């Protein structure tokens, strides 16, 4: 059982991003960018919403 | 603290492509190049 409604995307976004400052390497830029296409559904929930995607994912990871 | 401020940094990312093509053109690898690029700029103010 998991809680979803774009939860489960930016919950794991952030621990990737936070993985990356420390297991830097070469692929540093490899865990950013998987960080950043995880919340593109959150950010599709607020396209079709119609709400500002910034403002929701700025919430949401504050 | 604004929408403008989150466009400038797109406009600072874009802007380090004329490095990164210089490294792919050399055959030097982009990221270990531009990372020397960050870590002599903090003290090295100009012609680094």
């Known amino acids: ?62 | 603290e604004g929408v403008q401020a989150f466009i400038w940094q797109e406009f600072a990312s874009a802007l380090e492509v004329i490095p990164t093509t210089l490294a792919e053109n050399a055959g030097l690898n982009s990221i270990k190049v531009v990372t020397e690029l960050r870590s002599k700029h903090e003290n090295g103010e100009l012609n680094d």
């Not at chain 1, 409604?5 to 540093?28: F, P, Y």
């Not at chain 1, 559904?41 to 929701?56: F, H, R, V």
């Open chain 1, 1 to 62: 059982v998991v809680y979803g409604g774009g939860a489960a995307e930016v919950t794991m976004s952030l621990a990737v991003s936070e993985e990356a400052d420390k297991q830097r390497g070469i692929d540093q830029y490899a865990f950013r960018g998987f960080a950043q296409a995880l919340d593109t559904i959150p950010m599709t929930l607020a396209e079709n919403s119609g709400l500002d995607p910034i403002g929701t994912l700025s919430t949401l990871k504050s």
